Amino acid sequence: EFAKMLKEEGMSLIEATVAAAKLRLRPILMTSLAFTCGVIPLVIATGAS
């Protein structure tokens, strides 16, 4: 979505898409790792059930 907005602003597809990917690295990694670490206790369960 951010790449679409940037390209519509006037930047070329390569520049717009690469800028959108660069700027949104931290949100994506942060919100993926939050979920990944949240489910670790499920994976490493070692007792009943």
Q: List contacts with other proteins (CB under 8 A).
A: 1-2, 14, 17-18, 21-22, 25-27, 30-31, 33-42, 49
Please, what sign has the CA dihedral across residues 39, 41, 46, 49?
A: negative
To the nearest whole angstrom, how small is the minimum distance from the Cβ of residue 21 to other proteins?
6
Nearer to other proteins, 10 or 14 (CB): 14
Contacts of 6 (CB under 8 A, 6+ apart): 15, 16, 17, 19, 20
To the nearest whole angstrom, how small is the minimum distance from the Cβ of residue 33 to other proteins?
6
